[PDB]
Amino acid sequence: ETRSARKDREIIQAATAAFISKGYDGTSMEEIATKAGASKQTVYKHFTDKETLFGEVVLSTASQVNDIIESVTTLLSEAIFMEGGLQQLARRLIAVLMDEELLKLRRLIIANADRMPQLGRAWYEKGFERMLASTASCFQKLTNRGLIQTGDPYLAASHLFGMLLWIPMNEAMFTGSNRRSKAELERHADASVEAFLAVYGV
């Protein structure tokens, strides 16, 4: 990693925290520069403006989340047992996707749907669609191996995600309440997987 690459990562990290803490209107290029330990000049040269920088924050978060999802879908491909394997995936998906800072960023992206529509388009393409596509590729391979039966693996992926997250994600987005014991998290993931296998299991 070059010094320029590291500085850019530091700037995006600082911007991500600043936007979550203050919102778009509550922060500035100058404040982000200070938080990142960068000169104002460097932040302007590399990111142009606050709107552009917010777009890079969205893309960085989408990439980070998807790297995690890729690691967990790879683990499912190494499981002998589909119910346990899917339970482990579901439990990790809930923990990753219900992360408090990630939920705060999601709210900001939605709040800016009209003002900066590109943020939500980027999240949808590079975040949401990419994690369903990764899960779909995993399910296709599992289907080819006779371990599950998903004819439309992308649809099947959206069904798993939808059963798993419809209540918790909406509860967070509407109430801010993002609370669950380890016991509740697991019971929820397992019930979603049971229903999923009722449709897509062999």
Add this chain to the structure above:
Amino acid sequence: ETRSARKDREIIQAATAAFISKGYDGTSMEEIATKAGASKQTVYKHFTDKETLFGEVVLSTASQVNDIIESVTTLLSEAIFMEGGLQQLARRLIAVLMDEELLKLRRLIIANADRMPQLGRAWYEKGFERMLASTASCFQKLTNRGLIQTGDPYLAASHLFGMLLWIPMNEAMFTGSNRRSKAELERHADASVEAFLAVYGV
């Protein structure tokens, strides 16, 4: 209907249109009064502040949407053919929930749920949970009649909604709607019902 109740209803209808057009901060009590055919003093006498009026907008929309869904679920609860009946429910749910104006209001609620937690809780309890509850009530009755098997009706309702809406609702929230034809959304609804019946059908 009393004169006062009519004035309240008219102000709420005006406020609903204003908020959908320009958002929370972009809407003024003057604009609302103008649309309603009321003085700004009267709007303040009836609602106290813009936050309170927005809360009443949220409650009114929650009630309107749920009256529609309750009609659909009550009819299904008396039905005899399940595939067709559930397709009708799912197709109507996606039609109702994909309404451009409702989606705008939903983005506004999410955008403001952090700063107006009472408002987001109101949509969650009276909007989101009520449509699951109406659906669960229907499933409970159908299970009692031996037509489906949903031992946990509210969980099964959450599964139908999650399967139906994970893609369309996320796409709408992040990208400013779907843009999908009625035909595509109806086919999506049918697929969701096929999956639902593989888990919960007899």
